[PDB]
Amino acid sequence: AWCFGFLVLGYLLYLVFGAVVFSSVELPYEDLLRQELRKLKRRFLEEHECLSEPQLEQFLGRVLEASNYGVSVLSNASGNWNWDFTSALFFASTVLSTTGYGHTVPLSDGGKAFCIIYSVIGIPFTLLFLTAVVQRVTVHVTRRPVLYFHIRWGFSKQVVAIVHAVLLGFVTVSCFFFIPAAVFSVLEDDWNFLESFYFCFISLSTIGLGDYVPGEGYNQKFRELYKIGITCYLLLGLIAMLVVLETFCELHELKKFRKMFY
Amino acid sequence: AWCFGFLVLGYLLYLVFGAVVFSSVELPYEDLLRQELRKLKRRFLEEHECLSEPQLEQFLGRVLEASNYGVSVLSNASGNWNWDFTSALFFASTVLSTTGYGHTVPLSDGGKAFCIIYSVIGIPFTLLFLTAVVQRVTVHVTRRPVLYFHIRWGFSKQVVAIVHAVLLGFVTVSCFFFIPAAVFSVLEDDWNFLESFYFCFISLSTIGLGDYVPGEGYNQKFRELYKIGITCYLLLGLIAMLVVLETFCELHELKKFRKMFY
Numbered sequence A, B: 001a002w003c004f005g006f007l008v009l010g011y012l013l014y015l016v017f018g019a020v021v022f023s024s025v026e027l028p029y030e031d032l033l034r035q036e037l038r039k040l041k042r043r044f045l046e047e048h049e050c051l052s053e054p055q056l057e058q059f060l061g062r063v064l065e066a067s068n069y070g071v072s073v074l075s076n077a078s079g080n081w082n083w084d085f086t087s088a089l090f091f092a093s094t095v096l097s098t099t100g101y102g103h104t105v106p107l108s109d110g111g112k113a114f115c116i117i118y119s120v121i122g123i124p125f126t127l128l129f130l131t132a133v134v135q136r137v138t139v140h141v142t143r144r145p146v147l148y149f150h151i152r153w154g155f156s157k158q159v160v161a162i163v164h165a166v167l168l169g170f171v172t173v174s175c176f177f178f179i180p181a182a183v184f185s186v187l188e189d190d191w192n193f194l195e196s197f198y199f200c201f202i203s204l205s206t207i208g209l210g211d212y213v214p215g216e217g218y219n220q221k222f223r224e225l226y227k228i229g230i231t232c233y234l235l236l237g238l239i240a241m242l243v244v245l246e247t248f249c250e251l252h253e254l255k256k257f258r259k260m261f262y
């Protein structure tokens, strides 16, 4: 009934809350870096006294645009190749999965045209693949065992459904957040558990903001195999998430909530 | 029946197709830029003959990391502020909407911890808001008029549903892709219709790869109002997309397909 307006107001106010706290958290840091660059650049020109400021600007602009794409001039402009076939496979999985990883400017002019045609057919297609798998998977993982819980012990399905949903909710977080976060943290030599879990969450959830992809390690050994394994893991984790989500919707308490709310 | 395996093989082969074409499209361009930096940096050191290469590396690394975050040293390190309250509001809407816009490294250490707690409660919440609105909206926009089409002219609902779905599919693309792409293209002075439509598609779809957000224009006048209007537009466009998607699922031909497929 009228409560629907309450949800909209609460949600929009929640968004405002998120915005203000994000600004407070990131404003002193960004200001600190801004001040740091505003002294470092000036210092560079000061001590050298041999280089000109307008002339430096063209070089800085070109390199910065290059790093916006994702190619760095560091290491004699010879870092780990960024657009090899394997990384492209990770990129395609992340576009279809809607995680959308990539750099500040991800694709060149021609590649933005192609993405549109590729994705516009491949999003309903991947969605069709995902729904079919969760459908087939959910019957085997969740509905059929609930019947086993219902037949052998002969007690209320609703009690089983809540308990089954929570236990599944725990295993998937255990198996697909805590364990992978540990794996990535030990593997990558520049991360810790919090940051690795951040990547896990932002990957299994389809946010995928920015890039922040494990694999940018210089002189990585099995970079290709790593890339293809984190792609299969990503897609499959989205399935597991899209199964625990499905079971929660089936629950009487949650499905009743949405209907009573409306 | 067995056809399910055919879908999985076709989908995975489709992903491989996307990867190879993406690599071919982006490999010569990235190589060209890589070669260009591999001559430009060397030229810079050559003509100046006053600056040292290892000493330059620290400065380049610091600035490049700063631009990975999204703060540029250009314009005397005083460009349009990036983390003001309004931009943060756009960022929060894009995290909840799962579009995930942001730079190569979007958030500092503290802000990655906060995002997890904020999003983990706010994704089921925004999802709950979205489903409620499409539910209420769909009845008014689609079901009730279909009844008008069904009562007044008294002919097959299925014919109406297909025709109604296509017409709705046309209006929303007309109203929320072609028109906004035109608006952004004329507004922003550095884009054209193709690129603007690319942003529209990647925004209404939850991909949102990289950043590529209109608003980075230097000396923008009404940047704040622009930011808040493109946030309301983004969220609302996701609603319209999540309504045309819903109506297509209702169609007998499409719902039959998924069931016959399974």
Ligand SMILES: CCCCCCCCCCCCCC
Residues within 6 Å of the ligand: A097, A098, A127, A130, A205, A206, A241, A242, A245, B119, B120, B123, B124
């Ligand atoms: C790829 C299909 C569309 C997007 C699906 C997004 C699912 C998000 C699930 C979030 C689960 C809860 C995380 C805390």
Ligand SMILES: CCCCCCCCCCCCCC
Residues within 6 Å of the ligand: A120, A123, B097, B098, B130, B204, B205, B206, B238, B241, B242, B245
């Ligand atoms: C909002 C959170 C769940 C994800 C919904 C994604 C919807 C994608 C719609 C794509 C429509 C393409 C039309 C041509």
Ligand SMILES: CCCCCCCC
Residues within 6 Å of the ligand: A133, A136, A137, A232, A235, A236, B008
């Ligand atoms: C029960 C079918 C699972 C299929 C998983 C495919 C992962 C690429």
Ligand SMILES: CCCCCCCC
Residues within 6 Å of the ligand: A008, B133, B136, B137, B232, B236
């Ligand atoms: C029919 C209700 C529409 C609500 C729109 C809210 C936009 C922020």
Ligand SMILES: [K+]
Residues within 6 Å of the ligand: A098, A099, A100, A206, A207, A208, A209, B098, B099, B100, B206, B207, B208, B209
């Ligand atoms: K995304």
Ligand SMILES: [K+]
Residues within 6 Å of the ligand: A097, A098, A099, A206, A207, B097, B098, B099, B206, B207
């Ligand atoms: K998404």
Ligand SMILES: [K+]
Residues within 6 Å of the ligand: A098, A099, A100, A101, A206, A207, A208, A209, A210, B098, B099, B100, B101, B206, B207, B208, B209, B210
């Ligand atoms: K994204």
